Design a binder for this molecule. Sequence first.
Ligand SMILES: NS(=O)(=O)c1c(F)c(F)c(S(=O)(=O)CCO)c(NC2CCCCCCC2)c1F
Ligand SMILES: NS(=O)(=O)c1c(F)c(F)c(S(=O)(=O)CCO)c(NC2CCCCCCC2)c1F
Ligand SMILES: [Zn+2]
Ligand SMILES: [Zn+2]
Lengths: 243, 251
Amino acid sequence: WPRVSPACAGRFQSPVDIRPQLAAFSPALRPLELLGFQLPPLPELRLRNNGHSVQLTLPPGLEMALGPGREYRALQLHLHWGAAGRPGSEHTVEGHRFPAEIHVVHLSTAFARVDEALGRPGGLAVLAAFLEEGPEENSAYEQLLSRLEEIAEEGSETQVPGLDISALLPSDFSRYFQYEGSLTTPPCAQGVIWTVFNQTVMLSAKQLHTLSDTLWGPGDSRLQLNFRATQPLNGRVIEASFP
Amino acid sequence: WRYGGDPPWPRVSPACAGRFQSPVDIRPQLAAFSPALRPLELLGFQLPPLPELRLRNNGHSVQLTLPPGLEMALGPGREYRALQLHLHWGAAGRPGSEHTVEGHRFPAEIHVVHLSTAFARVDEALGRPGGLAVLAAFLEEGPEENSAYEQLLSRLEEIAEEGSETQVPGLDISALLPSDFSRYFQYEGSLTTPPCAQGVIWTVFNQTVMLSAKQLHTLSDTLWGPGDSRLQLNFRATQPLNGRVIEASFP
Ligand SMILES: NS(=O)(=O)c1c(F)c(F)c(S(=O)(=O)CCO)c(NC2CCCCCCC2)c1F
Ligand SMILES: NS(=O)(=O)c1c(F)c(F)c(S(=O)(=O)CCO)c(NC2CCCCCCC2)c1F
Ligand SMILES: [Zn+2]
Ligand SMILES: [Zn+2]
């Protein structure tokens, strides 16, 4: 990865191991505000297998704030997952890897283009939530997982009805960890604000199997275990929005 | 534009009418303690006497332009380069700091303005989150002549006229700031002059810097501004926090 892109050897990369006892509580971290996320069924959205993940392109109007006047627009979401019972979250908590992880990528409203934002502090912000195994089938996730067979081939795509993107995220928007790092694939650009929800979302075992067994990647590989190894904090302190 | 007279500042720049402006009144009881706020770190601030620097009466303040290689970090991965410093002050028996603490205005204030290392130019940084960072310290009266400040203040007579400048030897720029880099307030706000762009990270030191009565009088009584007015009381009114939470690096 450093071979094909030197930025991946920077000092301040993602993902990282979260250690809640070492997190710094700041009461200045207010609840996340996410407006415009309740999409109607039409227009439909592009869902695509890009060889690294499944990506869902989001329309204009999904507004997000990390604080007063620190506003963002959602661009896309994608997921990270494992294989055959083995977990594939990117972030870990006290060394525990979760079954999967959802990432919603946003662009700061101070930047008109993603390419201006790359490498600039706070230019990009990702909301990250862990996916765990639960007893019930998750309705929000089923809308996407049920469409994966259609895009099983690397590079294929389809159109899916609009859905409540906020329904894919955990219950409490006031409880999260936050630090600054990087994209977890090339170009590994730094200055990305990562916000990792404390609470998780639950999908059924079948849903998780569907996530990790349907899509194919580059060559004849299954699209599985699409997570980067944990990176050192190098002095960065993870903040927490709760004591 | 000028202090206490037209043109309103919104008519110069719409950003001067933003919700999240500086300076602010720091109420430390309402400050949020955050232990992620580590000691500030400065590199390259101890300058050789040559090349000289340019000290300028710009009509709104006295500024010292800083050379390239002055690096400042707010934390791991939060790196900045110093551009310049300037001052805010009052007048005979009247304080003129920009920031206040529980309504108290200090005699004067130093600001060292920095540019994030993600940006090559100021104009790309303006209005971007964390693009600009300012270090701010209050100036109070102490019993001794401050030798670092004397290097600048002894040259103000040469630049009494609006728009005049003079060359001064390099000095230890960090000697114009408090020795305590651990204890500070930090919030997001704006430039306090047009264009009043937001996204500026303000760091205000707990510890103050001491100047003599004579030095403080020299600072407020020597310079002339726009017209035939004395350059005095060159501070912007405090702006409402409007929901922002000031952070503190100590409980
Ligand atoms: N974990 S991540 O958020 O850093 C990440 C991925 F892991 C990832 F696989 C992708 S991907 O779907 O696009 C495939 C590899 O690029 C994006 N996508 C982009 C989101 C838009 C921001 C601009 C930078 C490119 C990343 C991406 F941002
Ligand atoms: N208080 S402040 O830090 O927001 C401020 C001033 F009050 C001030 F008076 C000046 S000045 O002396 O240079 C007068 C012109 O405004 C600057 N200076 C500039 C620093 C360069 C980077 C930001 C653009 C313009 C302000 C300045 F940044
Ligand atoms: Zn991702
Ligand atoms: Zn200033």
